[PDB]
Every structure is written in C-alpha cells, then in structure tokens.
Paper text:
Dye‐decolorising peroxidases (DyPs) are the most recent member of the peroxidase family to be discovered. Three DyPs have been identified in S. lividans; two A‐types (DtpA and DtpAa) and one B‐type (DtpB). Using serial femtosecond X‐ray crystallography (SFX), we have determined the pristine structures of the FeIII and FeIV=O redox states of a B‐type DyP. These structures reveal a water‐free distal heme site that, together with the presence of an asparagine, imply the use of the distal arginine as a catalytic base.
Author numbering:
A (entry chain F): 8 to 313
B (entry chain D): 8 to 310
C (entry chain A), D (entry chain C), E (entry chain E): 7 to 312
F (entry chain B): 8 to 312
The structure:
C-alpha cells in the first residue's frame, strides 16, 4: 500500500496543527481528508524538488469513531495520561493532526492555510506550533536531536503497520507532546551535568559508555529491547519552537511507530521510571503541556473516502 | 561613518523585537547596545557567508532622552497616530527595536535569545513577530513585495543620514507597523480588482500604466516626488507572518528613510487620503495594530 | 528482469526533444547508435553526477520499427492517429526516432544530442528539435503550473511501464509528442477567472476547481479518465516550455508516456473531438498542435542487446 | 553619480541576445521602452533575487542614436566597421537596439525579452535572437575555457566604463557583438596540441602557453594588445555558446565591452587583417562571423531620464 | 533482512582510507569499536546531514577474521594475492582492518577517523592513511574521468553484495585496496591521443574508444571481463586522488568492491600478467602499486550484533 | 594598487607551501612570481563562482635581498624567535610562502602542483600543510575560529600597507606558525575550563564578560590597544590539519597585518606573558614547530617584474 510521507527527507521547517472536530463537522472533515494529498500537490509540486513539502495527516481514536463506520486500527486509543510520582504526561484534546514539513516555512504555512480554509466552521484549533531547525540539528537544550533514528528498511520496519493489521498496512501511530523547557534551570548545569541528563556528549554527540551513562539519562530510559533482545525503535522528528519575549523555549516531540506500545513503553520509563531510575532527568527541565495519539493511515485510505 | 546593516542583502527569515525600557533598566540597555554588534558576530560568524545574520537596533524618541544626554537626531519624534476618515494608523509603545534578519530563523532566534537574555528584567516585551519569505518574495496578499526598493547608491542616498545631521551620519529612521489582513474579503476580489488595489499586475509584477493605475492604488499613493521632481524613496523589508489557527495573516511593515518625513508623507496619503484618493485601498484589507518610529544609529554610536 | 529507460526522470530544468527520420539505407547506422546510446549517456552525464540528472529516452516509430527489426512488435505501436475534430485537428507529422534528453542543465542535453547526431550523420534527416526550459515555478507559457497531477513512484511505474499484457516488451513505454504553439494575445484577453475555467485549476495557487465549478470543456475535466473498473487511467507528462520572442512563438512541448497508447489517445479524442458535454478542450482555443508523433521507448536492455 | 547598466555582471549561465531594427516611425515607442527597461528588469527579476541575477544591458546603434536623441553623440559611436581580410571577413549587419539579457536561468531572460518585445512589437523588426547557455566549466563550443583573462574589479571598471574623456556619457560602455558559427568537423580533426597552438592556451588545464611556444597567429597572441604606456589594453567579454544539433549550428556569440570601441576594433583588425607575423587569427579558420554590430550602452540614468 | 554497509555510496569528493593491523591482545578493543562504528558514524555525520553524506565501510582481513570472530568465514576471504608479472608487480602489504571513510568534506572524514583511531589507540598499528580528494569532474590524477562504467542500481547490488551463494554473509562485499604512485612527468610527456590509447577513453569527452580502436593493452580493454555465460563481470570502484606536491607524490588510491574477490583478481591478473594480445595494462607504465590488501566488509548488522 | 587576495572570502580548504630558494634559484623564482596570478586564473577561473581559488605569495627577509634590487618593505625582517619562561616561538627557514585557498582541496592541489612544477630544482620544500575547516568554522580545539577578524574597510585598514610605506602600498605581512596540539590534554578539560583558556563560549561563540574573562585567556592576550586606545587588529585564516595515524592534530596559524609589529606584540604577550598572565593558556595545549615572516606584495608588484 501507499504510505503517507512518515519517512520524510531532512526538513528545516514544520507546522504541527492539532484541531478538534465540532459537532456536525464530520462530512467537511471527510471531504478535506479525500483532498489533503491533492492540496499538498497544489501547494508543493510547483516548488519540487527542493521544497520537500509533505503533510502527514493523523486521526485520533474518538475522531476515528465519528468519521469511519468500519474497522479501527488495532492499536488506536486516546493518549494514556501518566501520573508519575514527580512528572505528569498530560492527555489533551486532539482529533486531527497535520504534521506539515518542508525545506521552507512558507510551503508549510500555505498548506496549513489551504487545509484550515477547507475546515473553517467544522473544527476548533487546539494547538499550532511553527518548528524550525536549530543549528546542526540541535534542539532547544543544545543537543543534537534525531541521531539514533532508524533509517531506510529499519525505519520502514519500525514505523509502518504490516501483516499484523493488514486492513491498515502502511499506516503508522503518531504521538505528539509539546514540551516547554526551564532554560534558566538547564543553563545552571555544567555541560558535563547536561551530558549526564541526556546520555550523550553535547558538542560531538557521542553516546556516553555503558559504565558512565546514568540509568536516569534520557538515552538510557528511551533505549528499549523486545523479548528477542532486539532494539524496539521509533522515528522522531522533534522541532524547536518558541518566543523569546515570553521565555518559551520548546521541543515539539513527535514519534512515529508501527504500534503505540513502543512509544508508550518509552513514555512509562520516562514519567513512571524503573527499578534503577526515578524518572527521565530531561523532565526536570521539560514540562509536557500537550499529549495526543493519532493513527496516520496509508495515503490511499484518505484518497478513497466519500 | 559605518552604518548598521540597514541595506541588508535579501533574507528569507526575520525577527522583529519591540520592547519598552522599564524604570531602572537604562544601564542594562546601554551595556547591551555596547555588545549588540559582538553578539551579532558571535551568533552569525560561524554561519559562513550564507547566514546573512544582521541586527539593526533602533531607539525611540522617549527612550533617546532616558538613554543619552546631548544632541538628538533631527527627525526623532514619537510615531504620529493618523485618525483617517475610515482607517487609523495607531501609535503603540516602543523604546527599542531589534530588526533581526538572516537566511534562516534559527540565526534570528539565537541572536534574539542572546539580546533578550542580557535585557531580562530591564525591558518589557511589546511585540515579537517571526517573519518568513512567502514564495517568490510575495506577501500575504499574493503580490511581489519589494520590487521598487532603491538599490546601490540610490538606496544609500534614500536611507542614510548625511551632512543634513552631521553628528548622526550613517543612521536611519525605521517605521514599523504590524498589519493583519482580511484574506476572506481579499479573496472575494477578482485578480483584476486586486491589481487595481495594489497598482501592479499580480503574476507578472508589471506596474499598471499611468492611464489605468487608480489614484487610490497602493503604488499611486506611496509614489512621492520631492522638491526637484525626483522620487522620494524609502527602503522596505516587509515580512509575512501569521497563525493559521487564529486566522492571523500578517504583513510586518518596516520602512527605512534618511528622514521620517518621506515615510510620514506616504502614511498620511494612505490613511488621511488626498484630493484624488479617499485612502489607500490596501487598507480596506489591512489593519495596523502597531505603529512605532525608531532612530537606528551608526554602528560606531552603539560602540 | 528488464531495465526500463529513464521514462520516470526526477524533475529536470532543461530538455532537448529531437525527432528525426531514418534515410533510405540508414537502418544499420541507427542500430549501431541504438546499441551505444546508454553508453553515450554515461559518457556525457557521469562526470556531472549526481546533480547533472542527464538521461535520454530513445523512442522508435511504427514504420521505423518495421524497417529496423524482424519478428514480434510492441502490441500498440502504430503511427500517430490524426484527429480531425469539427474545430481543432491533431496533425500526424513524420518521426522515426525520438531522443527525449533531460538534465538539470541544457549543456549536458546539448552535448548528448551532439554525440547522438554525430553518430547518425548521413543516416537520418532532422524533423524537429526543441530546447525546453523550466519556466518559473514549473509553469507553462499559459502561466499555469504544469505536471501537478502526474502519478509518482509505483503508481507512475504502473501507468507507464509495459508489463504482462505484452511480456516480450515489458519495461518499455509509449511516448506521444505534440509541439504546441499558444496564441498568447488571445489568452491574455481572458480574465484570470476565465483562464482558470479553461484549465480547471486556480492559476496562482494551482488548486483544482471544485466539481460544482469545473467546466466539462476544461482541460482537467477532458484529460481526467476513469476506466470501466473505476480506477483513474493515468499518463506521465514532462511538458516543456519553449519559444522565440522575435517570432512571437510561445510553446508547450507536450510529451506523454503510457503503458498503452489507448490511454493517451482517449485523452486526445476527448480534447479534439469532445464528448456529450464538451465540444472540445477549451485549451485548444489557445493552443495549435504543429506536430504529432507516437514512439515506442523500449526497455534499456532491448537497445543494448542490438 | 552616474549609475552604469550591469555591464559588469556576476557570472551568469544563461543569456538572450536580441538585436532589432527600429521601423520607420518606431522612435516614440522605442524611447518609451528605453525609459521603462530598468523597471521591466525589476518586474521580471526582483521576485527571483538574489539568485536570479537578471540584468539587461540596453545598447543603441550609431544610426539609431541620430533617429532617437538630439544633443551630443557618445564620442566613439559609429556603425560597425566591416573588415575585408585576405581570407576572412568581419561583416557589418543591421542592428539599432541590443538587449543583452543575462541571468542564472533562461526563464528570467526569456520573460524579460518577452516584456521588451511586447512593448516594441509594432515599432521594431527582429534581426537576431540567440539563447546562450553555459557549456561545462565555462567552456565554449571549441572545448576551451572562455573568459579566463577578463579583467575583474577596478581593472574591469577602468577598461569598460566611459569616464572624464566623455563626461556627458560617463558610466556608459561600447558593445561589439559578432555571432560566430564553428566548423566543428574541421576543429575535432586537430590534435589537442594543434587546438592549443590555435587558441594559445592548454585545453584541459587552461594554462597559457609560454612566450617561447605561443604561436604569433594564436587567438591569445592576436587579442593581446598593449597601449602607448606599454600596459595591456583590455576588453570585458561574456561569450555564450549556442546552437542547433539538427542544423549543425555550433556557435559562439561574441560580446565585448570597452570604454572606447578602439581597443575591440584593434583586436578585430589583428584577427581579420593580421600582423607582420600572422596572416590572421587561426580561430577564424574554424569560426565564421555571420553578424557584426556596435552599440553604445549608456548609463542607466540616461535611459531612465528619457 | 540484512543491512549492507554503505558500499554503494552517493558520489563523494572526500575520503580517508585507514588500514591498520591488530597488535597482540587488541581483539577485545577492536570488537568493541566494530560494535560501535555505525554508532560513531551517526555521532559525527547526523548533525552534518543531508549535505555531509558521511559513511564508513569497515573491512576485516582473512587473518584478522580468525582472531576476531567465531564460526564461519566468508567463502572468498583470503590474503591479497601478490602478482609478480614479467614487468609490474601487485605487492601484498599488511592490513587487518580497513576504514573506507567518505563524505562531501574531508573534515567530516577526519572527525570520524579521529573517533575510530581514538577507540583503537594501543590496540592497532597504523599501516596506511590516505586523504583522498576528487577533481571537479570526477577526474583522477591522470586527468581522466574515473567511475563512468561503474554499475548502478540493481546491477551494482548484483555485482557487489554477497547473496544466496554464501547466505551467512549476505549483504557483505569484498574490498581490494591498492595505493598507486604515478610518474606524472612521464604521463605528461604523452600526447592526449597517446594517453587515450593507454586508458581506452577520450580524455575531454569520456566517450569510450570503439572495440576496433581501443588497444588490447588499454586499461578499459583489460578490465573489461565477460563470464562463462557471455555476461559482463563488474566491480564497483571509488578511486581517489591523493598526494603531496613537496614530495612529488601524485597518487590514485584504488578500491574495488565485488560480490566475490575472483572478479577483482581476474582484472588484476589481466593488468599485471596480460593476455595473448597484451603484455600488461599500459596504465601500469605510469602507476606503481606500493600497497595491496583484501578485506571482507560484512553486513552492518554483523558488526552491530558483536 | 591591486592587493593579492589577502582579504579572501571564507574557504573550506587550504594548502600552505613554504620553500627555501636554492643557490642560483633566483631567476626561476622571479619567472614563477611574474606568472603566479596567471596560474591562479588558469586553475581557478573555470571553477568560479564556487571554487573561490586564490594564492597569496609571500617573500621572506633574506630572500628579498637575493631576489630584488630596489627598496625593501619597511617592516620586513626575519621572524624573531621568542624564548618564553615556559613556551618558545621557534624561528624556522622560509623564503617563499604560497597561501592557497579554495572551497575544494583539489583546486588548491592543482594550483600548488603548477607552482611547484615551475620551481622544481630551484627550491627546497620546508613545509606543506593541507588544511580543512570543520563545519561552522570550528578549529582543532572545537572552537569557532575567525569570529573577531576585522571585515570591510576595517580589514583593509588593519591588513594593507598604505602611505606609511607607499612603494609597497597594497602589500601585507604574513606570519605563519604550524601548531601541534596535545588533544588528549585538551579533551581532559571541561567545556567551561576550555572557555576560560580561549575566552569565548564554545557552543555559542559569545565572548566571556570582562568580569570572568581570564587575563591569561587567548582572547585577553591577543586583544591589543595602541597609543590612541583603539584596537590593533590582524586578519587570521587558521586551518586545522593532521594525520590520525601519527596522532598529529594541528592548527596552521596565519596572520596578516599592515605591519609585523602588531602580530609580534600579540606573540610577545602570548609567549612572554604580561603583569597579570604568565603566558597564553592556549600554548599549554599548542606547540609551535614553525615560525616565519613574509611580505605579501601588491599583485601588480609580482606581475610587473
Ligand atoms: C523534551 C523532550 C525531548 C527532548 C528535548 C529530547 C531530546 C533527545 C535527544 C537530545 C536525544 C539524543 C539524540 C538522538 O538519538 O536523537 C534523544 C534521543 C531519543 N529520544 Fe528524545 N527527547 C525528548 C522527548 C522524547 C520522548 C517523549 C520520547 C519517547 C516517547 C523520546 C524518545 C527518544 C529516543 C527513542 C531516543 C533515542 C534513544 C537511543 O536509542 O539512543 N524522546 N532525545
Ligand atoms: C499591508 C501593508 C503593506 C503591504 C502588503 C504592502 C505591499 C506592497 C506591494 C505589494 C508593493 C508593490 C511592489 C513593491 O514595489 O514593493 C508595495 C509598494 C510600495 N509600498 Fe507597500 N505595502 C504595505 C504597506 C506600506 C506602507 C505602510 C508604506 C509606507 C509607509 C508602503 C510603501 C510602499 C512603497 C513606497 C512602495 C513603492 C511604490 C513605488 O514607488 O512603486 N507600503 N507595497
Ligand atoms: C496543449 C498544451 C497543453 C498544455 C499547455 C497543458 C497544460 C496542462 C495544465 C496546466 C495542467 C494542470 C496541471 C497538471 O496536473 O499538470 C494539465 C493537466 C493535464 N494535462 Fe495537459 N496540457 C496540454 C496538453 C495535453 C495533452 C495533449 C494531454 C493528453 C494527451 C494532456 C494531458 C493532461 C493530463 C492527463 C492532465 C492531468 C489532469 C488531471 O488528472 O487532473 N495535456 N495540462
Ligand atoms: C569567434 C569565437 C571566439 C572564441 C571561440 C573565443 C575564445 C577565446 C578563448 C578560448 C580565449 C582564451 C581564454 C580567455 O578568455 O582569456 C579567448 C581569449 C580572448 N579573446 Fe576570444 N574568442 C572568440 C572571439 C574573440 C573576438 C572577436 C575577440 C575580440 C574582438 C576576442 C578577444 C579575446 C581576448 C581579448 C582574449 C584574452 C586574451 C588574453 O589577454 O589572454 N575573442 N577567447
Ligand atoms: C592507477 C590506478 C587506476 C586508475 C588511475 C584507473 C583509472 C580508470 C579510468 C580512468 C577508467 C575509465 C572510466 C571508468 O569507467 O571508470 C577506469 C575504468 C576501470 N578500472 Fe581503473 N584505474 C586504476 C586501477 C584499476 C584497478 C587496479 C582495477 C581493477 C582491479 C581497475 C578496474 C577498472 C574497471 C573495471 C574499469 C571499468 C572498465 C569498463 O568496463 O569499462 N582499475 N579506471
Ligand atoms: Mg499574437
């Protein structure tokens, strides 16, 4: 089947649009979903090959029930709120995700405008974030972000639904969380203390050894193995965002996975901890203010809608 | 003397930072002004020649008197609110302008972060806009934006203070207005109707001929001839901005001129109207929610 | 398995369309050149890779085929079918060999055209030569974005590549060329809104007109074909602007590839002869076809094995 | 104070050379186009800045000057001087206006040429139109690097722009154009070493032959000129490859700018009429001039102030 | 399933070739780095993407294989076979580990080389370190385009990657390295025509000499090899210029990847021992091999899983 | 006058060639000097505009006397060896400098090859360094290198000989030193400790406050004010180089100045120290193994021989 552009080339700009569908908004939404590929072509084609404009469209659990009368993707459910001893992963409203990426913010904005034009009156905006690449693929904590993402066949194997849910093959599960950083608290750490928090060297992005990597580092808690001892993997495209005047320095977290169980296991280790880690130290400097789970179906699922 | 980067090469990204100096914030502000060129080099240098990072720093009339003793720039005064028959050009608070431009937002955001971090607790944010290049130098109305800006020597005679105010030579006057657009109304016009509002053909960016250019087109009202019959010019770097969710479709207007009078003449013709023109038809689709005037000194002045 | 020619090229800014006839006795020279044309393409192109994007798709006409080769022929290979509509005519013009040369740069196309024609000197007569150039944001001389609804990836291969329906010629394709000249003065007399009604898409934003407003005689309405099984019948186009300002020649070089000529020829019949609902494609009221040729572009190994 | 036209252009990979004659009574229309030509350059080009690099250098012939303007003539303006050499002829061909249009892309050149001709259609007759393209690593149709010894910076400004010697026309220049067609068959018949003896430079490495080896009838030998003070007399060239493979047209469009036409004309006399040591420039044994025209390209403000 | 190393790399302008031997007791340190080398590639390369194009292909010699790994050996892995020809010798020199590091920039190559050699310090003895740079037009130190006839796509995969014939090692390849020093004074004494007869291609145009013209002792004649089924036997090369102007060192670092070492060895036999028609490859009259090593470059996941 | 490309656009790649002129090599060198700009165009023009190929040609004090009749440049003299309490700036032989830069090492190598092709048997190689910039203009110590270089008119003012020595106007003075780093010792410091050595922040390249910048930091000691109480500036294009096998991790230092006195004062502060600093902390991790001074004349001086 034909996947949406979950595996995107390198992109320097992104818009995350999360909306809820208003009472009676379903027909307008279905019409828009049947045209969303066509609208990405209308905005993007003229700018190819360099524009690299794509939209990954996601649908929430409750939205799915409202929109489609047939089978549901096997792993689709509302985002699971996590109430950890110190940190909380909040569950916030979100029926439709538009994960818009390009080499330029103008292409993202132009597509977001077309999509919201078609949806005006049928949806209510919940979140809008304009993400930007920050230096050499760094995030707002100044660490390279995306290093250990799977690539090529491993990325497709990690992200794209297959024979386990054949009606939904080539779909994926997207988890979003908007994080705001305490940059005063962070900049109070030495680089070495920051490296102990993340689990990688700051300037050179080399993973700390097994012997020095803390158990409560971000890398330690988000490194997960299945029972066969193979790494369980997700595909992240985290995007810096913010407003200097309001002291908002953010990471917009997005992780794609073939099943949400992997992303949810990483989140549990982060927020609830383990026997050797109280919680992910990154959360002592990062507050999640959104949390939503969406299924991003195969492109042909959206194209074939009435 | 050496100007700030008022005459910047074209940039695809910008941050417009307007702040008020809090009571007691003067010394922190003067120390930052000392270092703003150094912070620009610190953030920008390593981004090669492609980064094109610059910050143009401007000081408002009220701020000037709080910050500096002695002579004031000849043309420095607060933004003049225009109460037109239909359209208003509001005057809004602004002591400091940071006009940050680069080929990338990150360079703009990183330099904005350095500047605001130094001023934290000395200033109150008034406005912050993250501008992006829109297609082939187009604006939110879908028209090419910058076409008739002066270049080279003509740009320097238009924007840079010279012998007429010797102690402020190499400075400029910046006027900013944040505009929000009625895109629903605008998209209601035929392309031909839109071309009559702007005064240029939409796709080809060809100026309408004298015989068909409406007197209340944007181009007609912002074309000003001086005492000698030559064009009085300004240098604009207008930037699209917005939020699709809140239906904010924005033009951040910034015009630089040797003297505020040229920019002020254009605003009066636009908002107050003329014998031949009720007002600039662009204002039937564009609302000004800020208006501020700044003097952007010579680089040497800031130290 | 059979290696296709580069029918599916990444986007290219420059093209040379070279159409020649094979002179009496020229067949042996042509066969030698056909066995070397892939080798010449590597000679010119390799040093400019990866950005050069140089390729040549070689096509052979119906009459030329029978002059060059013995035994089985491509199932759909026939001379271009002249269409005499009530208003507009699609002429058939001579053409035995097509070289469809594309690159990121005209020089690579020019150099390869020179190598090919140097090998065919004394064996072929020039019929048509057009040097195409990208025109702003993938626009044509009518000022509309051209290529937006092309199929991509697997859908593109399915549309253009001969397969099991003609297995001896699997990996080949059918190219239809028509050199069009536009009446720009006539076109510029129409409002943008009237032009959008002719094409069926919005001019600046390239958004397809809604089903309620798209005219039945619009280009997009008449070149949108659904098969009896309900699926879209697709072709892959690489239309190239060309012209001469002094001669007031403003053209579209139309090239369309399809796994059978039937799809392309259906679109042509609808355009030139119209339907129940449309006298003819309104684009032809501003566009004159001055050439018409059909070629079979065989699998690369067919040409190499000669 | 005088603003030159873009005589000294950055390197541009595309050009259009448009030479036209002014019809009887076409003067008023041409004067209006000259007063608008910079505004049309901005209309087409500004949207593509900074990478587009679109410029038009507008040139006026000797006869055309007298039809269009009263007051002073530029000091060096006269019709191109036909050279009738013992073997080779530099023909004088009609041309009243030159538009030398350059950009990083042909589309911009073509769009600007289209706007200019749209204004002049009823007032002028096209005489020559050439679409030039960069060929490999700044090479010409003879396979040699072309432009190497051009002056740059201050030296170029001093060699090209009218100053104190003609104060009313300061910031102008003199353009000599010649369209050359090459006998590529004959050229490729030479060894690389024989080609190097014709040009005066090493072919692949572009290293100038030493004084002891450089033939006196080499191109470099005859187009190397010294003034009375003994310093080099220089022109600024922007020669552009062009051609048509089917018509076997392999062209160099020669254009040379000089502060006075006398430097360019001495080079032409040495090439075509030869010296004590050289019958003629050996490049002419492989190159035939089919046009020859001389233009004054005035300061931009001279054209604006019409 | 199996993940090949970046044997099939995008064209790269920079390379570092590192050959080391494993000291007494160096096995554990080496295995640890082998398990980390992909991780270190990402640490250095990710933050430089997508322009960086950093990769490292890691090879293991025959002797080193038995020191490091339990279980099966690759079926074709053996020490480099010295060829003592009538005139020229293919020397064998020591090498346990190969790091074939490539990127768009030498500084990225050097950063990865640093990390690898930092981990190996005290466990290995450096044998050879070459910093390769390609010329503008994929041209080598002899001034010929180098890579033209490399296979691409499926044919490259077919030629290079171990498949069903040795299934435990599928996705691996065999690397042969030879560092060549050129006699540039002797080479530059030849005419271009004479140099073309040595290589078997035209120097400027990179057009292959016809079978009737290509000398039997030409580099292209002797390295063109057919199977027992008449099909081409191919290898994938990425030869890099290197050297030192002070020391008058002008080199080609040869690296050839093949599914079996037998194809590369057949080519080396033809070059150094000649045929019935050729004493030896004329390229060796200007090129001396000073190193020779054979390595197995396993599937990436073989090294990852140590 | 036409300066050489001393004020170059940023370049990723460099070759530094230092040679001595053999006995009887003067005429061959003179011929090469008269052609070196011609050769730079030969290799560089067809690579434009992205190639950014230039060569700056420098002549040492002793060689000037062997090569030229006429006036000597005012400031030209042998590099002065500095014997500090801890660190030494060695003086090493050098008659000709070829400072070759481009976006690509192949362009540098092609030009170095044509230059050394012409000088074969007239000169002896002393140093050859192939330099590579890290991305973001970072050096072998991981720091952005070039940040406070003067630009535009300020750079012209700091670098080019003017009316002070009008027969050599458009010239400049190049000091070279090849530094080998102790990378193991360097990578032992915290980022914070390295920032105290350099005097700038590592990731953000923001200069340390006056209140925290150590007096023995590299920025503090290479920051010079003249009598006027205004900045004495040089123009640097330092290039990482090395060899992983030999554990050679280097910075090739090159500084251009209108007069050598400015560069030499910086070297005196670095190596001999001040009232408030024993020596430049950068020298605790950097050993100079070469040191030479050249005059890089106006291009037209070399052309007109
Ligand atoms: C404040 C929010 C976050 C920030 C700033 C952040 C930043 C980073 C950084 C700097 C790395 C190391 C480089 C890399 O491999 O990408 C990393 C790795 C990773 N992060 Fe995050 N991250 C955040 C949230 C999350 C969340 C919520 C999850 C999962 C639900 C997650 C999953 C991962 C994974 C799986 C890795 C790779 C670990 C490995 O296999 O080495 N991250 N992140
Ligand atoms: C909603 C706000 C604005 C928008 C969208 C806008 C857009 C444009 C456009 C599309 C053009 C034509 C192309 C060009 O030459 O740049 C233009 C021209 C111009 N605008 Fe604006 N503009 C705005 C506000 C202003 C304001 C407030 C001023 C002056 C105070 C101004 C002064 C000019 C001038 C001087 C020109 C050049 C006219 C000429 O000489 O042809 N604009 N503007
Ligand atoms: C005569 C000059 C022609 C011009 C200027 C032209 C131009 C265009 C334009 C502007 C579009 C809409 C954008 C797109 O999807 O590409 C389009 C679409 C199309 N054209 Fe053409 N066209 C021409 C001739 C033809 C011919 C002769 C055919 C078929 C034989 C054809 C087949 C198509 C198809 C299939 C589409 C896509 C329609 C859809 O599925 O939405 N065109 N063309
Ligand atoms: C007919 C086709 C022409 C071709 C193919 C051609 C080609 C070349 C080439 C390959 C060079 C050497 C590299 C360089 O640009 O410096 C050159 C140099 C030159 N050409 Fe031409 N040229 C032609 C006609 C002309 C004409 C008609 C003139 C003068 C009226 C001219 C004047 C020059 C000059 C002045 C030089 C520089 C010589 C020097 O100082 O080294 N060329 N040309
Ligand atoms: C001095 C060392 C070498 C140099 C400078 C060199 C250079 C070249 C050049 C210029 C080509 C022509 C363009 C191309 O197809 O890549 C070529 C082709 C080739 N070289 Fe080499 N080569 C060298 C050593 C070797 C060695 C040692 C082998 C094999 C063990 C080899 C195998 C080949 C092969 C197979 C081809 C392609 C021939 C074909 O099928 O057309 N080369 N080489
Ligand atoms: Mg017409």
């Amino acid at each position: 089947p034909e996947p949406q552009m979950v595996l995107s080339p390198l992109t320097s700009a992104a818009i995350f649009l999360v909306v809820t569908i208003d009472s009676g908004g379903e027909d307008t939404v279905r019409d828009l979903l049947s045209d969303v590929a066509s609208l990405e072509r209308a905005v993007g084609f003229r700018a190819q090959p360099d524009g690299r404009l794509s939209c990954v469209t996601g649908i929430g659990s409750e939205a799915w029930d409202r929109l489609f009368s047939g089978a549901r993707p096997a792993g689709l459910h509302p985002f699971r709120e996590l109430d950890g001893p110190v940190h909380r992963a909040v569950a916030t409203p979100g029926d439709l995700l538009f994960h818009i990426r390009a080499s330029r913010l103008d292409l993202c904005f132009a597509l977001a405008t077309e999509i919201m034009g078609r949806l005006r009156g049928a949806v209510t905006p919940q979140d809008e974030v304009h993400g930007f690449k920050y230096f050499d693929e760094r995030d707002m904590l100044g660490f390279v972000d995306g290093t250990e993402n799977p690539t090529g066949a491993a990325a497709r194997r990690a992200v794209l639904v297959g024979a386990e849910d054949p009606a939904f093959a080539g779909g994926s599960y997207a988890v979003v969380q908007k994080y705001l950083h305490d940059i005063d608290a962070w900049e109070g750490l030495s680089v070495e203390a920051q490296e102990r928090v993340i689990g990688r060297r700051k300037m050179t992005d080399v993973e700390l050894s097994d012997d020095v990597k803390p158990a409560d580092s971000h890398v330690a808690l988000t490194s997960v193995t299945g029972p066969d001892g193979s790494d369980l993997e997700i595909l992240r495209d985290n995007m810096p965002f913010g407003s200097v005047g309001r002291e908002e320095f953010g990471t917009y977290f997005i992780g794609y996975a073939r099943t949400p169980e992997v992303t949810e296991t990483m989140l549990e280790r982060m927020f609830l901890g383990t026997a050797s880690a109280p919680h992910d130290r990154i959360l002592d400097f990062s507050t999640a203010v959104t949390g939503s789970l969406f299924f991003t179906p195969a492109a042909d699922f959206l194209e074939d809608l009435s």
